[PDB]
Amino acid sequence: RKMAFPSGKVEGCMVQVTCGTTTLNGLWLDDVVYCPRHVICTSEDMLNPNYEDLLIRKSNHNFLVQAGNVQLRVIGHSMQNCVLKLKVDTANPKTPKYKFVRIQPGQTFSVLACYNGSPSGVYQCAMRPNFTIKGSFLNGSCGSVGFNIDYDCVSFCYMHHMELPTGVHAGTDLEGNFYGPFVDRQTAQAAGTDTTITVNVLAWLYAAVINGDRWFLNRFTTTLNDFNLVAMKYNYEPLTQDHVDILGPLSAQTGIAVLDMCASLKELLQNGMNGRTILGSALLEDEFTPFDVVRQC
Amino acid sequence: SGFRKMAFPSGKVEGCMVQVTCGTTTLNGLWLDDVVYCPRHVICTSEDMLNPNYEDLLIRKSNHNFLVQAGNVQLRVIGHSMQNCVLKLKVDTANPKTPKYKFVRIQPGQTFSVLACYNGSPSGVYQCAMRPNFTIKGSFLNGSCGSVGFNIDYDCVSFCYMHHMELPTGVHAGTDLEGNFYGPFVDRQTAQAAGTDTTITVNVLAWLYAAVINGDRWFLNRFTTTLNDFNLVAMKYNYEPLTQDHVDILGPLSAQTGIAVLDMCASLKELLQNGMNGRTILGSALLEDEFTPFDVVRQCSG
């Protein structure tokens, strides 16, 4: 099961930010609200917004920040890359222990999708190798965040900014730097060729075994390099020795050596699933990490 | 592609989770106002789970035998009673985080969010569909009992599931918040069989409406059917028969697309009888049956 972190610690931080006729979500931590800077744009600014120029022309009172019924008074504002930082006269009393991290491609996180400052849904995403995410985001979702939770600490890794014409999504870390080659201007932008997250596919095959499904296993093995030759041919990411090490626990747990499972995946890639399905899916799933699998098996 | 399982935000339910222990048996409970709800098998010794006489075991218990904790903070129990398969422990503190809530009993095919919990602490949240055989495909380990399933409408949490057990096939069974099991199961440590499962027709139809909303409509045919004629055919393909309530909950999608429910039923009947023919719907040759009409509207229209 694709499982998200419990979202309550993040829900207590979501607010609504309005500038002009633009409304999206903000993240309220201590006395700062973080949100996408394109909230200051107009229709006539969207194609080539000179954000430093647009921002100098704004006053604090141009920003309407609402937490529930209460309005939060903006006292200062600044910009860090593509994120606006609105200082408010009130520290959020529900601020969790938190950190800002930049996630690696192949890593997963939970998304709290929000509209008008109100949380609407929670789901798990992976940062794709081409730095998109296959999210579920509609008009007004910008400023929704992605996160992981370790102990009491919320690690924020993603803030939502845009939907590409293909229907995948792009955004920044909480320092305001985009993942991938994208730009917060209102243009049709293509991503690089996506690839499949191989280490995650292998983790999910191990999961399918741990739940007593073995039809895809085989008596064969492969070298790491010969596997990677076939993987690259099918637009799978190369598997590194660190990946092999990371997969150890799953390997021990099943007594299936990593390179044995690589030989199974090689078979699946070349033959196909030939009608069959694995853990319910007609397709190979690549958005479970080895940790995600182990924390649940 | 385009659609995914989305849970409701879990915070309102996190604020209600506690742990309940009797001896060395710990599971989770739900604290609403001044009552804690939990599975009655907390009062069983692991050796009593084989063939428990619950009424007998409960007469032996007193309020001071129940350890209820929010985190590490004990909640004093001042009353106890049993309602079907759940225990209601009256406590001396009303939960200040109690949301607006109701207790609802859902139908097969309906979806809900599960907040999986251990020792009163939430671990994860995910969407489940109640199968026609009254099991769910959860991710539940030892200590998960008393985790709850819910939906959120406006401010109001509708609690619909409390977790009690795992069947030999790996699927899960439980009760509503009044302690009544979904399906033919009993809270005994015996081997119990789930009825053979079937496909959730109303959710497949919702999926076809979702395809149409997104411009994928090759499967719309020129025919209509009666509900009876459809149900008789569907059952030969291990699809559930439709009810009047199913027709009703497809109303909004039917109105959105202008495709009458029975016309879509005729389209589905042709897919069943003739197959997909190497074609795809929403990018798949497989028909999805775990998105309800409500789930579809949320992800299409927001």
From Swiss-Prot, chain A:
Catalysed reactions, semicolon-separated: TSAVLQ-|-SGFRK-NH2 and SGVTFQ-|-GKFKK the two peptides corresponding to the two self-cleavage sites of the SARS 3C-like proteinase are the two most reactive peptide substrates. The enzyme exhibits a strong preference for substrates containing Gln at P1 position and Leu at P2 position
Reported impact of residue 46 to A: Does not affect ability to cleave and inactivate human TRMT1
Ranges where the Peptidase C30 domain occurs: 1-297
Recorded consequence of changing residue 202 to V: In strain: Zeta/P.2
Activity control: Inhibited by pyridone-containing alpha-ketoamides compounds 13a and 13b. In turn, alpha-ketoamide 13b (tert-butyl (1-((S)-1-(((S)-4-(benzylamino)-3,4-dioxo-1-((S)-2-oxopyrrolidin-3-yl)butan-2-yl)amino)-3-cyclopropyl-1-oxopropan-2-yl)-2-oxo-1,2-dihydropyridin-3-yl)carbamate) inhibits SARS-CoV-2 replication in human lung cells. Inhibited ex vivo by michael acceptor inhibitor N3. Inhibited ex vivo by compound 11a and 11b.
Residues annotated as the enzyme's active site: 38 (for 3cl-pro activity), 142 (nucleophile)
Domain of life the protein comes from: Viruses
Cellular compartments annotated: Host cytoplasm; Host Golgi apparatus; Host nucleus
Variant or mutagenesis effect after changing residue 142 to A: Complete loss of 3C-like proteinase nsp5 cleavage
Cross-link (Glycyl lysine isopeptide (Lys-Gly) (interchain with G-Cter in ubiquitin)): 2, 87
Topological domain spans for side Cytoplasmic: 1-297
Function: Cleaves the C-terminus of replicase polyprotein at 11 sites. Recognizes substrates containing the core sequence [ILMVF]-Q-|-[SGACN]. Cleaves and inactivates human TRMT1, preventing tRNA guanine(26)-dimethylation of tRNAs. May cleave human NLRP1 in lung epithelial cells, thereby activating the NLRP1 inflammasome pathway. May cleave human GSDMD, triggering alternative GSDME-mediated epithelial cell death upon activation of the NLRP1 inflammasome, which may enhance the release interleukins 1B, 6, 16 and 18. Also able to bind an ADP-ribose-1''-phosphate (ADRP).
Subunit structure: 3CL-PRO exists as monomer and homodimer. Only the homodimer shows catalytic activity. Interacts with host FBXO22; this interaction promotes the proteasomal degradation of nsp5.
Name by which UniProt lists this protein: 3C-like proteinase nsp5
Origin species: Severe acute respiratory syndrome coronavirus 2
Native organism taxonomy: Viruses, Riboviria, Orthornavirae, Pisuviricota, Pisoniviricetes
Included stretch of the parent chain: 3267 to 3563 of 7096
